[PDB]
Each structure stands twice: as C-alpha cells, then as structure tokens.
Amino acid sequence: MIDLRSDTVTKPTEEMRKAMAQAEVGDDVYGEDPTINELERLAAETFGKEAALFVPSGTMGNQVSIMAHTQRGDEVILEADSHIFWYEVGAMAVLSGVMPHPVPGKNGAMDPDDVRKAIRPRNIHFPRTSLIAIENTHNRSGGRVVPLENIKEICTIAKEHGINVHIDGARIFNASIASGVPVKEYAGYADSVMFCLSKGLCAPVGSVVVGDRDFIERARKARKMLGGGMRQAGVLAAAGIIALTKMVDRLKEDHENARFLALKLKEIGYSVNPEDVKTNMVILRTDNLKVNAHGFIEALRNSGVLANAVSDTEIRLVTHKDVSRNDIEEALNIFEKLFRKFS
Amino acid sequence: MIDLRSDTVTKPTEEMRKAMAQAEVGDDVYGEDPTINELERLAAETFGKEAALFVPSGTMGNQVSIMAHTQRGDEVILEADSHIFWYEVGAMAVLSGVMPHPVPGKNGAMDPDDVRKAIRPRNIHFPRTSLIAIENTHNRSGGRVVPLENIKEICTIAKEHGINVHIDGARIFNASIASGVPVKEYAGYADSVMFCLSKGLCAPVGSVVVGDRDFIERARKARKMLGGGMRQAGVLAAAGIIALTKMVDRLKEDHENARFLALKLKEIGYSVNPEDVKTNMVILRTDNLKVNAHGFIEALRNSGVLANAVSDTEIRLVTHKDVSRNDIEEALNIFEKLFRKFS
Amino acid sequence: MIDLRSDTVTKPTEEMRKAMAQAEVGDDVYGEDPTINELERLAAETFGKEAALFVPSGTMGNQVSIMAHTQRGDEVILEADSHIFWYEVGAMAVLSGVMPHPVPGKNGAMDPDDVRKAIRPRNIHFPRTSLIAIENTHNRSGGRVVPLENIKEICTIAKEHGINVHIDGARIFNASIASGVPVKEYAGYADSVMFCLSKGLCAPVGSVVVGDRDFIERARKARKMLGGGMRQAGVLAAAGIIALTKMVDRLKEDHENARFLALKLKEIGYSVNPEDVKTNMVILRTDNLKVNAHGFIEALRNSGVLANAVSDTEIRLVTHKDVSRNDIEEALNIFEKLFRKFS
Amino acid sequence: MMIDLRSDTVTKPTEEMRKAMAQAEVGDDVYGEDPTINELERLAAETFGKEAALFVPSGTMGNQVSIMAHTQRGDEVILEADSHIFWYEVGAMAVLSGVMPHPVPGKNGAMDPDDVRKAIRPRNIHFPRTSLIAIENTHNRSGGRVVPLENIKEICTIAKEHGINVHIDGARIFNASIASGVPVKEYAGYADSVMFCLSKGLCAPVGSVVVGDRDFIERARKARKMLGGGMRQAGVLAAAGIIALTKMVDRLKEDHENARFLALKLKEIGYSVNPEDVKTNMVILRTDNLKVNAHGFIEALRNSGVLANAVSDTEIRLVTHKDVSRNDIEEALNIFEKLFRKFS
Ligand SMILES: [Ca+2]
Ligand SMILES: [Ca+2]
Ligand SMILES: [Ca+2]
Ligand SMILES: [Ca+2]
Ligand SMILES: [Ca+2]
Ligand SMILES: [Ca+2]
Ligand SMILES: [Cl-]
Ligand SMILES: [Cl-]
Ligand SMILES: [Cl-]
Ligand SMILES: [Cl-]
Ligand SMILES: [Cl-]
Ligand SMILES: [Cl-]
C-alpha cells in the first residue's frame, strides 16, 4: 500500500540489511560493542558534542535526558503542543517526578518573553525551573521549522538563569534541510539534543542523545534503569550509521514530494494549504467532504492509501523514503477519484 | 503592622485559645482523639459528605486527594493559574507521579468545552485523565467566585467520562458568603472538597478534606505516608471546630473591607478594579507607577503595610479578621501618600 | 484503661496546656512564628547543630531528611528491623524514589563491617549509596540503646565514602538518659537527627529535625511539598519547648517503671528478660502460655490493660508519663491472674 | 582471543540468526504491524502456555514493566534477598513504580513459603500493601541454582489466598527447565507473569519477552511505551529471537555439561568449588584457600587469557555459554591449575 501515515514506517535500505548481517558486535553493557561505539562517536562528532548515547526510541532519548537534567520536584518549560507533553505517556512525571510548564508557541516557537516569564522565582512554594525543551520541526503544528533565532534567544535566557536546554530533534535533520541551518549550529545553543534514526533516516530502531560527557554518563545510567541497556545492539547500530551518514541529503526529496502532493491536492479541491508545507507533512482538512476524517481514512485504505486522522476534521499525510514520486502520483489519482465520490 | 499579605496570618480568637487549653485529646493514629473525631464528623455533615479527614495544611489536603483519586501516569485537568499548579512545589508530580493538564480559565472558570477537549482519549501514547480540579474563590485572579453553573457543567462532563472531581475549596466559605450558594450545594457537584480552617476562619493550623468513605480511607493512608498522621491533634481540632461553627458569618466583614479598600484605591488613582472585588482580595496593578510590584511592596513595607507581589506588575491585597476598618483607613492614608511618590 | 501500647499516648501536662493557650504565634510559612523559631533554635543548640525544622510527625521528619539527603535511584542503608523500613508506609520509595538496603543488626547495632559491605560499588547496575540511617533506642529490639562506639565507627565509614548519616532519634532522649551520652554527642557523629516531642516527652504533636543549614533548607522545602508547612504552629511549639526543656529528666521514671514491670513479670513466671530492659520497653514472649500473642492481647484488653502484639509470640509493653507506678502495680495484679489462666 | 566466562550475555549471533535479522520482514511495532515481532510474541506465549506476550529490549525492562503493571505506588514487592531485581536493576522499582522491596532470604534462590507468608503485610495504616511476589528461576547469585517447581507451586497457593500477583524473573528459565526436565509452561502455570531472556544462553543479540494474560500484557505494553521500549521495525531483532526460542534451547545441555566438567576439574585441582551445586551454566569459586582476593584473582586470570567476574571479595562467578567450547574449558582449566600453584 501507499503509506502516508508517518515517516516511522520507513524500512531498511538494502545497504542497511547487508550491514546488519555482517555487523561486528559485543556486549554494550560492558561498552564492548564496536558498532554502537562508532555510531555514538559519529553522532557526537556530527553534532559537535563531547559524547553520545544510543537509545531504543526517541521517547527514551527525551526521558533519559530529562532525568539527567533534573531532580525530583523540578519544572520543565516546554511548548504547549510538544511531543514530550502530548505523546510520551506522562513519563516525565513518573520517571523524573517533574512538572511540565506548557508555554504556547507559534508553530513550535515559544515567544522568548513568555519563556522567561515562565521561569520560577526562588521561593519555597515553587518548583525549580531546571530545563527548557524545544522541538525542532515541531510535529503537531505540521512539521514546522523553529527559527534559529528563536532557539538562540531562548538559549541566552537559559544561560542567564543557569537552566539546561534540550532540543527534541526527532526530525532535526528535516529542519536543517529546510532552513539551511547545520545541525551543529542548532546543537550549539543546547545542552543536549535527541535525534531519531528510525524516522526519515530509515533505520529500523533507535535514536541518539548527544551532549556533554557528564550529562551523557548520567543519561547512560538512566538508560540502564529504564531498560534501554541492550547487549549486542551493534546489529541496530550498523543500520544507524548508514542512516546518519548516508540518508540525510535525500530528505530534500521527501520535502519536494510533500509540497508536490499538497499543490496537487489543492488543485483537485481538497482543503490543504501548500504554503504551510515546509517539511515532510501535509495537513488535510475534511470539512468540505461528505464523511469526516475517520470515514475518509477508511475510504482511502480501501483504495490503497494509508493515512491517520488526527481529529474528526483533519488527516495528516507524511512523506518519506518509501513513498516515491510515482507513489505520490498514484496516490493523487486515488485522491482524484475519491473527491468525485466524497465532495 | 497592617498585614495585607494573606488571610493566613489570622491569629486565634480568645475563645479558640481557651478551647485549645481544655481540648479533650487522644492518639489520632489510633483514631482515638475525640476532638479530631468531632471536627471530622462536623465537617462531613456540613458538606453533605460521608467522611472527613483533618490535615496540617491545605497543600496536604490537595495532595492526599490527588493521591487518593489517581494512579501513576494519570493526568489531572486543572485551571492554568490554580494553586495546585503554581504554589504547591510540584508535589503532584513527586507524590502521585501525575501530569497536570493546564486549561485556561476566566477568573477560575474553565470553559466546560475546553475541559471536555482536554480529556485524553484511550491511546498508548496518552496518560489517563482521572481527575479534574476546580478552585473556588480562585486566588490568582483576585479571590474570584467560580459560578455554580460552571461547576455543574464540569461535573456533568466528569460524570459522562467517569472522572473524579476535586474542589480546592481553600476559601469555599468566602465563595458561599458572596454567592449565596451553600457549601453543601457546591460539594454535591464534586467527589471531594478540601477547605481551609487556617485562613479566613482564623484557626492556627489545618484544613479538612471531605468525600466518600472509601476515598477518605485512601486519603488517610496517604496522609500517614506524607507525615500528616499526628498524635493528640485535638488541640488543633478544638480551634478548628470554632472556626467552622463560629467564624463563617463574619467573613462578610472582610469582603466589605476589601471592597472599601479597592473603591478608595481607585479614587486615589491606583490601577484596581473595584467591580471585580467580591470576596476578600484586591489585585493592584503597578503599570502606572514609577516602580514595579517588587519595588512598591518594599515602599509599602517601609510605611507600615505588608503585601505580596504575585508578578512583576501585580500585587495581591488580602483582608481578614485581624485587619479592621480602622486599619484599612490607615492603610489608605499610607497608599495616598505613596501615590504622590510613585505615580 | 491502663495503656501500655506506646508512649505516643502521653497527654499534655497542665503546664503545656497553659503554654499552648498563651502561645505567641505568627505565620510559619513566612518564618514569623516566634515560638516555632525558639523551639527550632533550642533544638539546634541542644543537639549541637546549626539549624532545625519542626515537623508534624516523626515520619515526616525522617522522610524530609531522606529527601534532602538523596536523589532519585539512590539507596539508603538501614537496620533490617528499623521504623523507616517497617512503619513508614513505603514513603521512601514514593517520595524520594530510593531503595532501602536492609542490614542486620544486634539490638539496633549494625556491624560496621556489614555496613561497609552494603555500600554499592560504582557500577551502572547499582544505585548510589548516599545515606545510612541509624535508629537510636531501636524500637523493634525492645527499646535497646545503640552504643556510641557503633555510631562513631559508622560515621568514620560514612566520611570515607562521602555518605550522609541520619539518626532516627525518635527516642534519642531515652537513649541518652540510659547511657549518659548527651544527645549532642550522638549527633556529633551524624549529619542529621530527627527526634520526637510527642512520645516520652509528652508534647501533643510533632518532632524536630536538626542538621546543617543547607540540609535544613532543603528539608524545609521538602516539608512544604509534603504538606507540613503550617501557619500559627507556635501553639504546638509552646508545648514542644516544655517537652524539650522540662520533660527529659523524668524519663528515668519511665525506665524505672519498665524495669520494675519486667522484674515482677519474671517473678510471676512470664517469659521476660529484665536484663534486656534499659529504657521504657519490655518485650514479653507468650511461649509458655496456652494462647498466642494476639489472643493474649485480647485477654489483657478484656481485663483493662492495653498493649500491642509485635509478632505471633511477642507483645510489647511501653511505659510513659501516663502510666504511673500505681498503674504498673494494678497491671501486675491482672498479669498475675492471667498467668494462672493461660500458663 | 580470550576465554570469556564472565557471563552468557556475551553470546554472539549464529550464522542463521545474522541472515534472518538482515532479511527480516518488518513493520512499525507501535502500530502492532511488525510480522516478525508478532510471531515471536505468539510463539513465546504458546511456549509458556499464556494468552499474550510482549517483546522488550532488555530483561530489566521486562521485569520493570511487569512490576509497573502489577503494582500501585506505595506497594511492597516480596523478592529474594539476593535477586537481580533488588541488586542489579538500578533501583528502578523505587523510581519507576514507587514500590518498596521486601527482601526474604532464600536457600539456593528458594524462599521458604512460610517466610513469604510471614512477609505479607497485614492491613494497617503504617504498612504498604503487598501486591507482588517475585521469584527468580535459576537464581543467579547463588550459582544458577534451580528453584523447585513445588516451591513455586506453594508460593502460588499462598499468593492466590491473599490475592497477590506472582512474577517469575525467568531470565534463565530455560536453563532451569533443561536441568529439571520441567517444561517452562509448568513454571509459568503458577505465575501471573514470566520474563525470559533471549540474549543470554539462547544467543540472540537483543531482548527478552514477558508473557501473561491479555489485560496484564496490555498494561505492560503501555508501561513499555512510557519507559521508551516502544520500537519501530524491531522485527530485525525478533528474527533472531524466534531462532533463539526454536533452535537454541536444547543445546543449553552442552553449557551445563561444560560447567559441570569445569567444576569437577576445579575441585580436583584444589579450588573451593562445589560440583554438587552446579546444575546449570554457572560455577561459584571462592578464594578462601588462595593467597589473593577475588579481584586479584580476576586480574591474574585476565593476564593469562581468561575473563571472569568477581561477585564478592571472596567469590568469582564462571559462566558457560555457546561461545566457550569444551576445548576452551580445557584450556582455562590448564591455566587454573598453574595459577593454583602461584596463589595457594
Ligand atoms: Ca523506520
Ligand atoms: Ca491562621
Ligand atoms: Ca503524646
Ligand atoms: Ca502504690
Ligand atoms: Ca547475547
Ligand atoms: Ca584441549
Ligand atoms: Cl562480531
Ligand atoms: Cl532527584
Ligand atoms: Cl484529654
Ligand atoms: Cl499507582
Ligand atoms: Cl500572638
Ligand atoms: Cl520488510
């Protein structure tokens, strides 16, 4: 089928499958897996940080970072529509015993003044604000790119207050491709960055957290506690190395396909805004259709297209390596036929 | 001094001091303190609930209620400027491992539709919404009365979804006096209610939580875990009974004094809204002054008036039994003089 | 009835009742209650520490100390039969996220070598041992006194490893009176000490934690989070000052009464060991009786004597101010009758 | 290279596993669409006679999501005093679940049922609620000892009477089964949940599996999401797991035979070992009759080409597995014999 549900569905490339088969492994608990070690070295180097830590998921990456940055009772400033707040099972409260302090943002960009204002003064009644999280290519807003200036401004505020900064960079490479800002530049304004290998980069499993050596050591212990301490994970790291070093540039193709898809959907008559498509995501409203988002998703599936409804009136279409231009053209033929039926 | 910082500064009445001296006591851990037992019996009766639990503070009252209503990883819907979120040291995250889900409100009144939208659907990525908290006479907005209709609507939504409702009624009697709604009526739309004895009611220590027998049993065990299980606490309960049974009616005097204070401050030229003052609080804005809230608080202190800044531009003035009309008149003379200096 | 269940049942003396009624108070949240302030000053001075914190219960005292001494995932070494492990509702795990590391002891004295062995090496699999707790006049062993030499040796081990030491001194004054070791000497070999005012010292409510200024500041914030931040608690502190300054010497009377009780029970034929009784507790075994401990407790209750079973073959008898020699004599007459019935 | 007797965790993937992983049919596990993970879980559930199963990245996560699914904050978990959950899991039970461990000493990993019964908390405001009893099969610290089925049966009876959940940390449950002749489904029949490792003696590179009832597994799956174990195309790992479960269990007998040989021969040399206690893949060696300590002996072994771990200042643990052959054992023994001359 044509899977436009998310970039998480990407499958390993032939190069990855071969590398996994001949991957040199060792027990990572003893720090003896050579491939995991190289992946972490490469990740650190790539983001200009002192160290890196491989994790089974982006969620664990964010959570071990929060654990390594905070103490029980602390407060974490984050954007009101960020993944850490909405889609991580309330892990920050259970695992770290910290409270989120949602701050509204415009497509992932929290007004620096609102962030500064959300910082807690020192008083016995108040939690200590110890961390500020920023999500780049903010998902809920539709894969929008947070301006480098916004991140720089917030980094300055954090510095003045002695507050740590964490960038949820699950799709930071998509941000870099769209903005032209090198990932090292983003990373420089943060204490830690979590980036996914299993989404647009096509690795089957995992993410990586990069930051200072002491922070990473604390995160590695947190990883052990959470259950992310694997044995011969070099098999996964082999695909991870290829994802990090050879699958970044082509993300531009996903962006081009998403824009093309949006432009053509608008032409057909669907409620989409091509001008809002900055990375690999397209938001499709169903207000003008005879069935709502849930009913339309079912019609799409029957015709060979997979997508998710994010509300009763919205569907999200996401492009990635396993959605070629031919697939986009085929999907458009299907959307054309369904518009005749459901408009 | 003329202490307008909070109604918590109220000192025991002569009748309270004597009652504490002759209080009949016992070991509360064994449930043998007769005065604590009578206080809880009286509180439950007054609020139309099955049981009650005495606690050393309102913070503990709120926190044991959250513990008794939730499980780790749950989410708690509460108003964005509520005390549980801002002034309770992030306790909900540490003690219950729950995540707050802030919802904007108009003077403490969360739009029922927004509350409905904040409820989490059943999905692996989401925490379970198990509690909705409403604060009556919302502190931050200026001791504002939450409309009974608001509470009724939210109660209905909660019932629909099988969600618990907790009323932070620290100043519920102030609300009752101003609105004319009996506290028993407010309580009927909630599963639990925490009310303070140590604020406007003048008791030196404590609050009480009322609710169903099984919930109170869970709250009592939580109280033991938190360290609120005292011994001969009947000494405190003696004053509590008097606070509950003899100090409710006179709260009207505090409301009169607060309104008078606000009216006269407006005439002087200060940025206050007398029409918004319905209970014992007055929010004073410093945007039209030469110094901010922190600087003005210091000036007030030097002239005999104590108050707290609640932001860089807002000051909260609170009236209570230990601030007479004469004290208010004296404070106004001071405010008058300071307007000449800082306007 | 004749209450030998615990020393927690002690009621206020007339002097205490008068002091509570005339207590000079203030709002403790602002650090303005003069009596709480003097109690803390006196407590610190008496224990030779720079700071102190009044709390509603010994449980809260121990728990805020644990919170202030540890970080999530840490381990706390403690005696296998200590109160923090057995009678504090699993609070250490919930509030501080720490693991208890039980170490056997002989009448409360953990072998220093066993303590050194229980300290965790630096390994990713292990929690960090950050606290060692010692209970003085160890309850479960029968109110036994831990030798100063034991505490001194453990203190040295702790210093070598940079580990904190907390003394659960709920009954530290009983230990001091029996041993001749001043409480400031026990405390000199510890970082913090919690002692109760509501047991043998006869105050109706509360305990105090003593320690260094920074530690107490953290413990004070923990107290706020837990709900121990009261307002005009000076009413309680007034009785607390009398407990600390005037009720310590008479503890020798409780020790004398416990010894007399034990000697006479032995004379009757009960299985008691007068040689093990050095403070205010007597352990009686039901080994030579035709009933178990629980059945014996019931028989005692029906005859006018209250006590607690601590196992299926052992019951604990505790003396205090409210069980006079006359009461011990009357209890013995009852014990004599019951011995003929169940022996 | 060196003879690695440190642990069975160092086992490397077999040729068949490597090919199956690289060519694995995958899908997004978050959507429950990875076919290989689904088959691994189906097979695991079937093997243990349970309704459902959950793949996890580590045995630690397997145990922790089980504790989370079985308990509520403030609860107490009865477990053996020297069990892995208490000693080697970073205090996770306290941080993640807010529960207190209630250590019960055991005899060769087996807790006396009456001691377990006595450890259950009475209902009292001062006491946490006992909601879970955990049993470790082939108890590691005691030397990979096999807990009798009757011990587990008796504890199950006590738990049922009290309405308490039972979890078996079966990291090496297949080693227990091969040695005892007891099918793993029989051990599991007396438990609510069982966690077993695929990455130790079974030779898979990564992961473990938790088995149990449908509702419990659903709760454990949500816990797994919270802890960060919700992976995407994990079928790559599951492919090796299927082979571990289907083709690597029987040969564990070889690891046991190698460990028995090692123990018998070490005894013959003069080392303080008890061949009579060796029934699975572990040998405990005490350094009581050596002029060196445990850590010093480990260093000496390293210098001679043998890798082992000290588990006490006087105890070393030797573990056999697929990657240590009989010839490797003979080599280690010949070295042990000489080092006995130097340190005795
Ligand atoms: Ca993928
Ligand atoms: Ca008061
Ligand atoms: Ca008392
Ligand atoms: Ca007499
Ligand atoms: Ca392996
Ligand atoms: Ca050979
Ligand atoms: Cl290899
Ligand atoms: Cl912490
Ligand atoms: Cl009385
Ligand atoms: Cl829970
Ligand atoms: Cl006063
Ligand atoms: Cl595939």
- Experimental approach: X-ray
Identify the sign of the CA torsion D245, D250, D255, D260.
positive
- Which residues are CB-contacts of D221 (< 8 A; sequence separation ≥ 6)? B124, D54, D65
Within 8 A of C96 by CB-CB distance, chain A residues are: 72
Asked if domains A1-246 and A247-342 share a fold, the reply is: no
Helix, strand, coil percentages in chain A from 3-state DSSP, rounded to 5: 45, 20, 35
Per the CB < 8 A criterion, the answer to whether D11 and D321 are in contact is yes
Instruction: Break chain A into its structural domains and give their ranges.
Output: 1-246, 247-342
Q: Inter-chain contact B90–A98, Cβ cutoff 8 Å?
A: yes
Distance B246 CA to ligand 2 centre (A): 15
Q: Name the residue among C73, C124, C224 with its Cβ closest to that of A220.
A: C124
Q: Inter-chain contact D94–C89, Cβ cutoff 8 Å?
A: no
Which ligand neighbours the alpha carbon of A234 most closely? 7
Q: Name the residue among D90, D98, D125 with its Cβ closest to that of C93.
A: D98
| Residue D254 token pair | 């070889």
Within 8 A of B72 by CB-CB distance, chain D residues are: 68, 72-73, 97-98
Q: Name the residue among B86, B97, B102 with its Cβ closest to that of A93.
A: B97
Within 8 A of D87 by CB-CB distance, chain C residues are: 125-126
Chain D interface test: which of B120, B221, B223, B226 (most D C-beta within 10 Å)? B221
Per the CB < 8 A criterion, the answer to whether A44 and A235 are in contact is no
Per the CB < 8 A criterion, the answer to whether B129 and B123 are in contact is no
Query: Chain A: nearest CA to B98, how far in angstroms?
Result: 6
Per the CB < 8 A criterion, the answer to whether A333 and A29 are in contact is no
Per the CB < 8 A criterion, the answer to whether D174 and D196 are in contact is yes
| Residue B146 token pair | 């939450």
Residue located via tokens 């009616």? B249
Instruction: Name beta bridge partners: B167.
Output: B134, B193
Counted residue by residue, chain C has a size of 343
Per the CB < 8 A criterion, the answer to whether D3 and D258 are in contact is no
Q: Provide CATH code, domain B1-246.
A: 3.40.640.10
Q: Inter-chain contact B86–A124, Cβ cutoff 8 Å?
A: no
Q: Taking each helix axis from N to C terminus, what angle separates B14-21 and C14-21, rounded to the nearest 10 degrees? A: 170
- Give the other-Cβ count within 10 Å of A329's Cβ: 13
Helix (H, G, I), strand (E, B) or coil at B43: helix
Amino acid (one-letter) located at A34: P
Distance B11 CA to ligand 11 centre (A): 7
DSSP state of C9: G
Per the CB < 8 A criterion, the answer to whether C336 and C326 are in contact is no
Distance A24 CA to ligand 7 centre (A): 4
* Contact with chain D for residue C79, Cβ under 8 A: no
- How do B2-3 and B305-306 pair as beta strands? parallel
Residue A113 φ then ψ, to 5°: -70, -35
Counted residue by residue, chain A has a size of 343
Residue D59's nearest CA partner among C206, A57, A29 is A29
* Contact with chain C for residue D126, Cβ under 8 A: yes
Query: Chain C: nearest CA to B19, how far in angstroms?
Result: 8
Chain A residue closest to C123 (CA)?
A221
* Contact with chain C for residue B209, Cβ under 8 A: no
Q: Inter-chain contact A73–B90, Cβ cutoff 8 Å?
A: yes
Chain A interface test: which of C63, C98, C221, C223 (most A C-beta within 10 Å)? C221
Distance B236 CA to ligand 6 centre (A): 82
Size of the C and D interface in Cβ pairs below 8 Å:
62
- Where in C88-217 does DSSP place strands (E)? 99-103, 105-106, 109-110, 129-135, 164-169, 192-196, 207-211
Q: Inter-chain contact B230–C205, Cβ cutoff 8 Å?
A: yes
> Helices then strands (H, E): number in chain B?
14, 14
Query: Chain B: nearest CA to D222, how far in angstroms?
Result: 5
Q: Name the residue among D88, D90, D98 with its Cβ closest to that of C94.
A: D98
* Contact with chain A for residue D2, Cβ under 8 A: no
Per the CB < 8 A criterion, the answer to whether C216 and C51 are in contact is yes
Query: Chain D: nearest CA to C100, how far in angstroms?
Result: 8
Phi-psi group of D227: left, alpha or beta (phi > 0 → left; psi -120 to 50 → alpha; rest → beta): alpha
* Contact with chain B for residue D123, Cβ under 8 A: no
CA C95 to CA C102: how far, in whole Å?
Answer: 19
- How do A2-3 and D130-136 pair as beta strands? unpaired
Per the CB < 8 A criterion, the answer to whether A173 and A136 are in contact is no
Helix ranges (H only) for chain B are 14-21, 34-46, 58-69, 83-86, 91-96, 112-118, 148-161, 172-179, 183-187, 213-226, 234-246, 251-268, 293-302, 325-342
* Contact with chain B for residue D302, Cβ under 8 A: no
Within 8 A of A124 by CB-CB distance, chain B residues are: 89
Chain D interface test: which of A96, A199, A231 (most D C-beta within 10 Å)? A231
Q: Inter-chain contact B224–D125, Cβ cutoff 8 Å?
A: yes
* Contact with chain B for residue D226, Cβ under 8 A: yes
* Contact with chain C for residue B90, Cβ under 8 A: yes
Query: Chain D: nearest CA to C83, how far in angstroms?
Result: 10
- Give the other-Cβ count within 10 Å of C121's Cβ: 7
Residue D67 φ then ψ, to 5°: -65, -40
* Contact with chain D for residue C127, Cβ under 8 A: yes
CA A204 to CA B173: how far, in whole Å?
Answer: 59
A58 marked among binding-site residues? yes
Which ligand neighbours the alpha carbon of D329 most closely? 6
* Contact with chain B for residue D131, Cβ under 8 A: no
**CA B171-B177-B181 angle, 5° bins:** 95
Residue B109 φ then ψ, to 5°: -95, 105
Q: Provide CATH code, domain D248-343.
A: 3.90.1150.10
A10 marked among binding-site residues? yes
| Residue D161 token pair | 């009477």
Distance D24 CA to ligand 12 centre (A): 6
Q: Inter-chain contact A93–B73, Cβ cutoff 8 Å?
A: yes
* Contact with chain C for residue D295, Cβ under 8 A: no
Query: Chain D: nearest CA to C218, how far in angstroms?
Result: 20
Query: Chain C: nearest CA to A87, how far in angstroms?
Result: 24
CA A232 to CA A208: how far, in whole Å?
Answer: 17
Helix (H, G, I), strand (E, B) or coil at A140: coil
Residue B235's nearest CA partner among B39, B35, B53, B44 is B35
Q: Inter-chain contact B92–A74, Cβ cutoff 8 Å?
A: no
* Contact with chain A for residue B122, Cβ under 8 A: no
For A27-40, give the DSSP string. Answer: -GGGT--HHHHHHH
C326 marked among binding-site residues? yes
Fold of B247-342: Aspartate Aminotransferase, domain 1 (3.90.1150)
Which ligand neighbours the alpha carbon of C231 most closely? 2
- Which residues are CB-contacts of A89 (< 8 A; sequence separation ≥ 6)? A59, B73, B124, B125, B126, B127, D222, D225, D226
Instruction: Name beta bridge partners: D266.
Output: none
Stated resolution in angstroms: 1.8
Q: Name the residue among A71, A225, A229 with its Cβ closest to that of C71.
A: A71
Helix (H, G, I), strand (E, B) or coil at D111: strand
* Contact with chain D for residue A128, Cβ under 8 A: no
Query: Chain A: nearest CA to B124, how far in angstroms?
Result: 7
Helix (H, G, I), strand (E, B) or coil at B176: helix
CA A133 to CA A183: how far, in whole Å?
Answer: 16
Helix (H, G, I), strand (E, B) or coil at B189: coil
CA D147 to CA A143: how far, in whole Å?
Answer: 54
Query: Chain B: nearest CA to D227, how far in angstroms?
Result: 11
Q: Provide CATH code, domain D2-247.
A: 3.40.640.10
* Contact with chain B for residue D225, Cβ under 8 A: yes
Q: Taking each helix axis from N to C terminus, what angle separates A14-21 and D15-22, rounded to the nearest 10 degrees? A: 160
Identify the sign of the CA torsion C164, C168, C169, C174.
negative
